[PDB]
Design a protein around this ligand. Sequence first.
Ligand code: CL
Ligand code: CL
Length: 128
Amino acid sequence: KVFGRCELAAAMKRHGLDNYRGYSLGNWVCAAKFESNFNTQATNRNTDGSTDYGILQINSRWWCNDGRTPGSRNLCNIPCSALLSSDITASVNCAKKIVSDGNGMNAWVAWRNRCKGTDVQAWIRGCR
Ligand SMILES: [Cl-]
Ligand SMILES: [Cl-]
């Protein structure tokens, strides 16, 4: 599923990401744009051998199991493939754990490099 921008904002708000750990909804939408281009099916291998999965590019070294990342933890207790669903529920629940872990949204490299410090509210402007 390639989400539309407002469509993703709606789904993230429904699942309770707006202001979760103090991050406004446009932070989450901006993270998704730059991590996955709003594509639930996105996968990208990282230099360390892990892979990032789904709409928020959640990593196989710590958060989900893909069965090919030595030293994997699976702190969200999910197969990584479940993060590619057209339904974002598992991705959102796992992102909640991630963002609660200590460094907040800085856990998302694309957020830190392309969203943090910018006008993130622009990402939900025009949406109902
Ligand atoms: Cl916002
Ligand atoms: Cl924070």
